[PDB]
Enzyme design. Structure first.
Site, PDB file in Angstrom:
ATOM      1  N   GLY A  25       0.815  -1.206   0.000  1.00 21.40           N
ATOM      2  CA  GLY A  25       0.000   0.000   0.000  1.00 21.40           C
ATOM      3  C   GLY A  25       0.848   1.255   0.000  1.00 21.40           C
ATOM      4  O   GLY A  25       2.076   1.168  -0.059  1.00 21.40           O
TER       5      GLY A  25
ATOM      6  N   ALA B  60       0.787   9.392   2.033  1.00 16.09           N
ATOM      7  CA  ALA B  60       1.387  10.709   1.826  1.00 16.09           C
ATOM      8  C   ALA B  60       2.877  10.728   2.168  1.00 16.09           C
ATOM      9  O   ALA B  60       3.638  11.476   1.554  1.00 16.09           O
ATOM     10  CB  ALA B  60       0.669  11.730   2.686  1.00 16.09           C
ATOM     11  N   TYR B  61       3.289   9.931   3.160  1.00 14.71           N
ATOM     12  CA  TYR B  61       4.682   9.902   3.574  1.00 14.71           C
ATOM     13  C   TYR B  61       5.278   8.530   3.357  1.00 14.71           C
ATOM     14  O   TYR B  61       5.445   7.776   4.323  1.00 14.71           O
ATOM     15  N   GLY B  62       5.578   8.211   2.101  1.00 12.04           N
ATOM     16  CA  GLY B  62       6.180   6.934   1.750  1.00 12.04           C
ATOM     17  C   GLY B  62       5.294   5.897   1.079  1.00 12.04           C
ATOM     18  O   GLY B  62       4.340   6.235   0.377  1.00 12.04           O
TER      19      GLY B  62
ATOM     20  N   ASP C 150      -6.951   8.868  12.866  1.00  9.26           N
ATOM     21  CA  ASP C 150      -7.359   8.567  11.498  1.00  9.26           C
ATOM     22  C   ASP C 150      -7.944   7.164  11.374  1.00  9.26           C
ATOM     23  O   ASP C 150      -7.610   6.425  10.437  1.00  9.26           O
ATOM     24  CB  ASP C 150      -6.206   8.780  10.498  1.00  9.26           C
ATOM     25  CG  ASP C 150      -6.684   8.927   9.062  1.00  9.26           C
ATOM     26  OD1 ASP C 150      -7.867   9.294   8.862  1.00  9.26           O
ATOM     27  OD2 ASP C 150      -5.882   8.674   8.144  1.00  9.26           O
TER      28      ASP C 150
HETATM   29  C1  LIG Z   1      -2.125   5.087   4.268  1.00  6.06           C
HETATM   30  C2  LIG Z   1      -3.033   3.885   4.004  1.00  6.06           C
HETATM   31  N1  LIG Z   1      -2.366   2.567   4.450  1.00  6.06           N
HETATM   32  C3  LIG Z   1      -2.190   2.454   5.943  1.00  6.06           C
HETATM   33  C4  LIG Z   1      -1.748   1.037   6.301  1.00  6.06           C
HETATM   34  C5  LIG Z   1      -0.437   0.674   5.594  1.00  6.06           C
HETATM   35  C6  LIG Z   1       0.032  -0.719   5.989  1.00  6.06           C
HETATM   36  C7  LIG Z   1      -0.343  -1.793   5.229  1.00  6.06           C
HETATM   37  C8  LIG Z   1      -0.114  -3.121   5.650  1.00  6.06           C
HETATM   38  C9  LIG Z   1      -0.624  -4.232   4.941  1.00  6.06           C
HETATM   39  C10 LIG Z   1      -0.425  -5.504   5.483  1.00  6.06           C
HETATM   40  N2  LIG Z   1      -0.864  -6.675   4.846  1.00  6.06           N
HETATM   41  C11 LIG Z   1      -1.291  -6.819   3.568  1.00  6.06           C
HETATM   42  O1  LIG Z   1      -1.355  -5.899   2.764  1.00  6.06           O
HETATM   43  C12 LIG Z   1      -1.660  -8.224   3.178  1.00  6.06           C
HETATM   44  C13 LIG Z   1      -1.400  -8.619   1.746  1.00  6.06           C
HETATM   45  C14 LIG Z   1      -2.792  -8.397   2.198  1.00  6.06           C
HETATM   46  N3  LIG Z   1       0.222  -5.721   6.636  1.00  6.06           N
HETATM   47  C15 LIG Z   1       0.704  -4.684   7.284  1.00  6.06           C
HETATM   48  C16 LIG Z   1       0.573  -3.344   6.861  1.00  6.06           C
HETATM   49  C17 LIG Z   1       1.006  -2.230   7.603  1.00  6.06           C
HETATM   50  C18 LIG Z   1       0.725  -0.965   7.176  1.00  6.06           C
HETATM   51 CL1  LIG Z   1       1.241   0.370   8.156  1.00  6.06          CL
HETATM   52  C19 LIG Z   1      -0.598   0.847   4.072  1.00  6.06           C
HETATM   53  C20 LIG Z   1      -1.090   2.253   3.710  1.00  6.06           C
HETATM   54  C21 LIG Z   1      -4.398   4.160   4.650  1.00  6.06           C
HETATM   55  O2  LIG Z   1      -5.110   5.022   3.755  1.00  6.06           O
HETATM   56  C22 LIG Z   1      -4.594   4.861   2.432  1.00  6.06           C
HETATM   57  C23 LIG Z   1      -3.519   3.792   2.536  1.00  6.06           C
HETATM   58  O3  LIG Z   1      -4.094   2.514   2.224  1.00  6.06           O
END
Ligand SMILES: C[C@@]1(N2CCC(c3cc4cc(NC(=O)C5CC5)ncc4cc3Cl)CC2)COC[C@@H]1O
Length: 262
Positions: free
Chosen positions: A13, A16-18, A121
């Protein structure tokens, strides 16, 4: 790409920051998530908050590495993905699953609030699921300390995601951190039960918000939600943050304690 003894195999995923990547250790095969941040004061605060976290419904922090101007934040990988991808648009999900996710969300929020941290958030994109479908609150880039030395600090910075923000963030100079997280948990509950967000923002000029304040529950998304969780949504989505239900009282709610199956 790689970081020391890990390979960055897939993009999980981005924000905004990375960006977040799947890191696989070449030797042990252990899979973790790594936040890759380009360019410092914000990440310093984030790493400090991350190292305080130790709870089953909160994403674990493993450690960090700096390679030039790139910071790598190693976290627990949640193999079930996000709560966002379990919500069927215009439908939601089965009420027993929504209730189980809601109890686990409450457990994570009580923990964060207990250690004086507000996430700021809360939304389904930030609620991840492990291999046994256990909810984990993820992403602490907007999180802040609201209680230190048993002394509360009122917040004033605008942050979050508009459909999930509480109305006091738009109408007040300063506001309490806890009612804000409780309000976004109510929007998450509405989303799980109806697969639809009720409004763009809870502002004076939003007709769907005014419709909710006037109790027009014959409209969407409220008409898709049963009277029991709707009664809890009526106590969570209250405009005055001081009249809004607190988490100790959410744990005494009829629907919260209602046995459900399927
Ligand atoms: C900013 C946002 N995200 C916030 C969480 C962020 C993240 C993702 C993860 C995904 C998974 N596990 C998986 O993906 C498995 C394969 C299915 N595990 C740990 C994760 C830890 C974090 Cl911090 C990705 C970015 C939130 O708003 C828009 C964006 O999506």
């Amino acid at each position: 790409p790689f970081v020391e003894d890990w390979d960055l195999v897939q993009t999980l995923g981005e924000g905004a920051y990375g960006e977040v990547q799947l890191a696989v250790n070449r030797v042990t095969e252990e899979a973790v998530a790594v936040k890759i941040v380009d360019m410092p004061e914000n990440i310093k605060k984030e790493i400090c908050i991350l190292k305080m976290l130790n709870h089953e419904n909160v994403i674990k922090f493993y450690g960090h590495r700096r390679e030039g101007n790139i910071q790598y934040l190693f976290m627990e990988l949640a193999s079930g993905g996000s709560l966002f991808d379990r919500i069927e648009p215009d439908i939601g999900m089965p009420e027993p699953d929504a209730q189980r996710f809601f109890h686990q969300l409450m457990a994570g929020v009580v923990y964060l609030h207990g250690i004086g941290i507000t996430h700021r958030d809360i939304k389904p994109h930030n609620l991840l699921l492990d291999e046994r479908d256990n909810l984990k609150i993820a992403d602490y880039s907007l999180a802040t300390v609201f209680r230190y030395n048993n002394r509360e600090r009122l917040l004033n910075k605008m942050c979050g995601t508009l459909p999930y923000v509480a109305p006091e963030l738009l109408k007040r100079r300063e506001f309490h951190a806890e009612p804000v997280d409780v309000w976004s948990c109510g929007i998450v509950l509405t989303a799980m039960l109806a697969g639809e967000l009720p409004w763009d923002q809870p502002s004076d000029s939003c007709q769907e918000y005014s419709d909710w304040k006037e109790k027009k529950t014959y409209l969407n998304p409220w008409k898709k939600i049963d009277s029991a969780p709707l009664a809890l949504l009526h106590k969570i989505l209250v405009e005055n943050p001081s009249a809004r239900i607190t988490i100790p009282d959410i744990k005494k709610d009829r629907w919260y304690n209602k046995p459900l199956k399927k």
